[PDB]
């Protein structure tokens, strides 16, 4: 079935976080049934599993959209105008950061750093980096993304 991956991992409590990462790879999020089978296999309380899963910002309990927009709010991007580009993205898309659109097209996320601090205003859309972003340019990129291009 879908939950076969759990038994490849060692039934020690230390395997929880790798198992959570494997679950979020397999399903895109953390389902309840998978979490209870993880708690059963590792013999850890389900409250411990939920505390670990809610501690880390990687894990979410609802599936992600098609286009994931990652706004870098590191120091280099912030001093070069990350607030203005996030304002442009939020105003064009219509959701705040950390939310999914109702149709599930655009998921908006905030990330720490992407390594390209020289392209200081930088976002990432599905592992593709767009850099040197004035608010107008990122509005153009969002509008071109919405119409099925890119």
């Amino acid at each position: 079935i879908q939950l076969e991956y759990i038994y490849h991992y060692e039934p020690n409590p230390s395997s929880l976080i790798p198992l959570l990462q494997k679950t979020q790879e397999t399903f895109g999020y953390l389902p309840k049934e998978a979490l209870e089978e993880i708690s059963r296999y590792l013999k850890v309380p389900l409250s411990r599993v939920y505390g670990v899963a809610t501690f880390y910002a990687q894990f979410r309990f609802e599936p992600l959209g098609k286009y994931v927009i990652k706004i870098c709010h590191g120091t280099a991007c912030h001093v070069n105008g990350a607030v203005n580009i996030s304002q442009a993205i939020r105003e064009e898309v219509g959701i705040e950061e950390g939310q999914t659109t109702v149709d599930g097209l655009i998921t908006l996320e905030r990330v720490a750093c992407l390594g390209c601090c020289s392209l200081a205003p930088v976002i990432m859309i599905n592992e593709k980096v767009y850099g040197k972003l004035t608010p107008d340019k990122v509005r153009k990129i969002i509008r071109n993304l919405k119409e099925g291009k890119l």
Partner: protein, 953 residues
């Protein structure tokens, strides 16, 4: 190891944490440290000053030459800031707003809960911790508590005054409650003034031990309750009963003894240790306008004193009363009842009328005419009053926010034809009498220090209307109680220190914790009460319940006589009205560590203001409430439930400011399986986790722990029973117990509060006459159940030996051979029992190996024989091991059986049964023997109405 704490030399254990030793020698705050867990650094309140810097003492290990300052300025500031940070995210009320509205700060919630239970004597006992005349207050108080009530935000405030009147009259009728007087302190206090303030000072100084003498000018005690308050509001038989309850405590009354005429203040100081001046304001203020000397200008207090004393009062047909206080209203209604057409003139509006509003509405019904914003300017007549000149007034400028002052409207002068003018514009004490005795007063009101209530003379205190001017009975009783507190502090030498502590307790914390009196006074007079800003939107979920209406006497009939206009409520409406309380106060207010620390460190709630985390209360569980709004995030519940109980009921959720405690997302506490859910109520330090109590209203009471054992099984776990005047509130966990924790069976099933009332014969309850007949007729072999203490077993065994009756017990086998050390040290165990039926085995066997071969200790369920390895034989009766030790095993053979205790497996027995009750476990005293062979003591929570010893004779 030698460490230096605040300059002194100390020897401490090396392995143990420093916080334990420091809390042994001094006071160290801290939420999150429990010795069963490793040190946790979450509360950050146990800070000490080391040579390296400021660090937490729960993590430090005692080292050689370590010097630690526990109370320095920086440490006080750091703890204060930490407490203010915690309070900035705290949501809840320590006390209900009813207690803050009462000038005497009475536990309104507690005695309303006691009234809802039907315990009126206990409710009056709780009332008398803050005031002394609950019937008088139920009749005449302006009900400041009902103004502040949180029921004002939903429908209608609780009838606190009328419920208090009902309970107080029940106590006066069905036997009055009198307090306990401690041994004499050897001190004498002179009290001047037989009014409510003097009575309160005398009562609360008598309840401390000092011998009190009351001096009063009038022939009777009561003051303006007897000579100023009319008898249609306060009947004098009720006043006599209430004052009798105050005076029967041992107060020496000297009536018809005045100050300045019979005894001077200097003689009073030389003969008595402290003197309280509550002479009251018995002079009436003149108006100063010309013509005030005309015949027909009576003063309100003199007129009401003549009417109350029965003296001949001459009154005309038209009477004008000037003033707007309670004095004016009583003058107006008394003059209406004597036969006069009464008009009351007040210089302000109706809203700013100081009078009791219920009395004003009653007077408007009875036909008293009011004209507000009017002021008399002149009284016109040859020798007697014929007419009075009045000027219309308007509100003036707001000035320095002084609620404006009435300024006359020029040209609006009008004349009213009247026969008598009664002056009720205010009261004061005689200024010349105050100069005769030497007390510093301004405008006739005595100047006293606001904290200590002390005059310019040493040993002289003041209160009542002498200090507050025209005031209330409850405010006078508050001043009297505070003066009793301050007189007791003055007689020990601690008054100056206490005043400094009450001004700023954060600078004298060492003296506060070192002195019992300073701690008590600080927590009585300046406690930290946490508040929430609630509007009407926060009580929309509450059921709308109507307030009780008491049928007043007919206005047309009551305008002619001096019969009491308001009766007492009927007893059927009392419970219905008392059950409307929303119990706004915190259930943990008497044991919450956060409130105590905020009291000691002078923490303000508004020091840091921002956004708080808003949570919904999780009260779906039948017995336990979880309130994350009162969670200080110490982690003790998580540490217990994951590292000691292994149940994992709750855990930390989310990160940072959004962190809270709860089950897995999508489930509440009702879905969580665990027999140690109720231990979290004792684990929590502040009151985020609380227990639902099996009473109608759970209102927090000052319960006293009682050390006893549980009767759920052979473990006989040590516990505290929380008792409040014969009420078995809850079972809690002792720290000094061999088990430390108790299960949800003991807490929530309460086997210690269970007893069958009457003997059962063949499945039907019978009276004791039938039991005596059965005992006399049949052979009645004696079968003992394991619910009896060791002394009872000895008594029953000796009775059987003396009389020859065959004796046995339902329990058979041999006792356990293992000790708690053996179970603690062994690692491979044989478990032939169900783990769920003996819940402490879950805690005792954590991490052990459950094997079937090569074991070290064995756990078997009785009846059984000891095995080769040290065995743990577990029965279902607490004193099963005591029965096995005394040698009363087996069921002997006979015709009919009398069994002492309703134990199961008695249906296996052959014949006919007489089940005699064994009694309440909580009402029992003696020792028991539990599974591990310990002899554990049982103590009485309350007096026993049944004993098995006298039943058998």
């Amino acid at each position: 190891v030698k460490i230096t704490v605040n300059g002194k030399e100390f020897e401490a254990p090396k392995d143990k944490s420093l916080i334990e030793f420091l809390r042994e020698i001094t006071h160290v705050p801290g939420f999150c440290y429990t010795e069963a867990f490793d040190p946790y650094g979450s509360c950050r309140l146990c800070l000490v000053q080391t040579p390296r810097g400021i660090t937490t003492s729960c993590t430090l290990k005692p080292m050689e030459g370590l010097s630690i300052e526990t109370l320095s300025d920086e440490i006080i500031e750091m703890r204060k800031t930490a407490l203010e940070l915690i309070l900035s995210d705290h949501y809840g009320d320590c006390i209900g707003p009813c207690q803050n509205g009462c000038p005497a700060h009475s536990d309104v919630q507690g005695y309303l809960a006691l009234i809802a239970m039907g315990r009126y004597h206990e409710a009056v006992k709780l009332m008398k911790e803050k005031y002394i005349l609950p019937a008088v207050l139920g009749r005449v108080c302006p009900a400041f508590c009902e103004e502040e009530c949180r029921r004002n935000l939903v429908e209608e405030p609780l009838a606190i005054r009328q419920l208090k009147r009902f309970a107080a009259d029940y106590d006066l009728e069905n036997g009055p409650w009198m307090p306990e007087i401690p041994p004499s302190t050897g001190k004498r206090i002179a009290v001047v003034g037989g009014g409510p303030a003097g009575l309160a000072c005398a009562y609360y100084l008598r309840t401390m031990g000092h011998d009190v003498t009351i001096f009063d000018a009038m022939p009777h005690l009561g003051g303006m309750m007897r000579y100023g308050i009319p008898p249609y509001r306060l009947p004098k038989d009720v006043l006599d009963k209430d004052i009798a309850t105050v005076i029967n405590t041992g107060i020496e009354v000297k009536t018809n003894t005045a100050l300045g005429k019979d005894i001077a203040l200097e003689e009073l100081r030389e003969q008595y240790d402290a003197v309280f001046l509550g002479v009251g304001a018995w002079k009436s203020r003149k108006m100063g306008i010309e013509g005030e000397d005309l015949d027909g200008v009576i003063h309100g207090t003199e007129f009401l004193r003549k009417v109350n004393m029965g003296e001949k009062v001459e009154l005309g047909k038209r009477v004008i009363v000037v003033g707007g206080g309670n004095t004016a209203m009583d003058v107006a209604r008394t003059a209406l009842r004597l036969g006069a057409d009464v008009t009351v003139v007040y210089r302000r509006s109706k809203s700013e009328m100081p009078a009791n509003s219920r009395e004003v509405e009653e007077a408007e019904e009875e036909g008293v005419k009011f004209m507000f914003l009017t002021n008399p300017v002149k009284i016109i007549g040859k020798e007697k009053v014929e007419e009075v000149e009045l000027i219309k007034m308007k509100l003036g400028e707001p000035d320095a926010s002084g609620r404006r002052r009435p300024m006359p409207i020029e040209g609006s002068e009008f004349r009213v034809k009247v026969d008598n003018v009664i002056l009720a514009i205010g009261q004061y004490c005689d200024e010349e009498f105050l100069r005769t005795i030497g007390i510093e007063a301004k405008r006739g009101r005595v100047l006293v220090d606001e904290v200590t209530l002390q005059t310019n003379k040493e040993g002289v205190f003041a209160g009542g209307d002498l200090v507050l001017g025209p005031s209330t009975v409850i405010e006078s009783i508050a001043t009297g109680r505070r003066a009793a507190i301050m007189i007791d502090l003055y007689l020990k030498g601690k008054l100056e220190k206490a005043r400094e502590v009450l001004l700023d307790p954060s600078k004298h914390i060492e003296e506060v914790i070192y002195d019992e009196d300073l701690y008590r006074v600080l927590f009585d007079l300046r406690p930290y009460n946490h508040w929430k800003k609630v509007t009407e939107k926060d009580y929309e979920h509450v059921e709308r319940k109507p307030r009780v209406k008491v049928k007043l006497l007919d206005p047309e009939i009551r305008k002619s006589n001096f019969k009491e206009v308001e009766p007492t409520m009927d007893e059927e409406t009392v419970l219905t009205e008392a059950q409307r309380c929303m119990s706004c106060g915190c259930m943990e207010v008497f044991r919450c560590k956060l409130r105590e620390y905020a009291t000691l460190y002078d923490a303000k709630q508004d020091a840091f203001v921002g956004e708080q985390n808003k949570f919904e209360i999780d009260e779906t569980h039948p017995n336990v409430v979880l309130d994350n709004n009162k969670c200080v995030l110490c982690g003790q519940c998580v540490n217990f439930t994951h590292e000691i109980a292994r149940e994992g009921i709750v855990d930390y959720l989310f990160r940072g400011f959004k962190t809270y405690i709860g089950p897995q997302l999508g489930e509440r506490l009702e879905d969580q399986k665990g027999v140690f859910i109720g231990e979290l109520t004792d684990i929590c330090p502040v009151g985020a986790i609380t227990e639902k109590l099996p009473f109608v209203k759970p209102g927090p009471w000052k319960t006293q722990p009682v050390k006893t054992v549980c009767n759920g099984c052979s473990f006989a776990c040590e516990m505290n029973i929380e008792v409040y005047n014969d009420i078995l509130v809850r079972a809690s966990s002792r720290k000094d117990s061999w088990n430390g924790y108790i299960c949800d069976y003991c807490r929530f099933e309460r086997p210690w509060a269970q007893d069958i009332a009457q003997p059962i014969l063949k499945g039907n309850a019978v009276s004791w006459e039938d039991a005596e007949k059965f005992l006399e007729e049949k052979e009645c072999a004696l079968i003992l159940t394991p619910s009896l203490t060791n002394e009872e077993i000895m008594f029953l065994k000796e009775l059987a030996e003396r009389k020859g009756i065959p004796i046995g017990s339902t329990i058979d086998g041999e006792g356990s051979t293992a000790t708690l050390e053996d179970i603690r040290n062994a690692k491979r165990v044989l478990l032939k029992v169900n783990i769920e039926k003996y819940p402490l085995l879950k805690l005792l066997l954590k991490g052990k190996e459950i094997v079937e071969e090569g074991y070290e200790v064995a756990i078997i369920e009785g009846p059984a024989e000891p095995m080769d390895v040290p065995t743990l034989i577990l029965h279902d009766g607490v004193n099963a091991t005591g029965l096995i030790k005394a040698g009363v095993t087996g069921i002997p053979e006979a015709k009919a059986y009398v069994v002492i205790g309703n134990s199961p497996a008695i249906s296996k027995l052959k014949g006919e049964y007489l089940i005699l009750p064994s009694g309440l476990w909580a009402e029992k005293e003696g020792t028991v023997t539990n599974a591990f062979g310990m002899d554990l003591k049982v103590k009485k929570a309350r007096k026993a109405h049944y004993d098995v010893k006298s039943l058998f004779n």
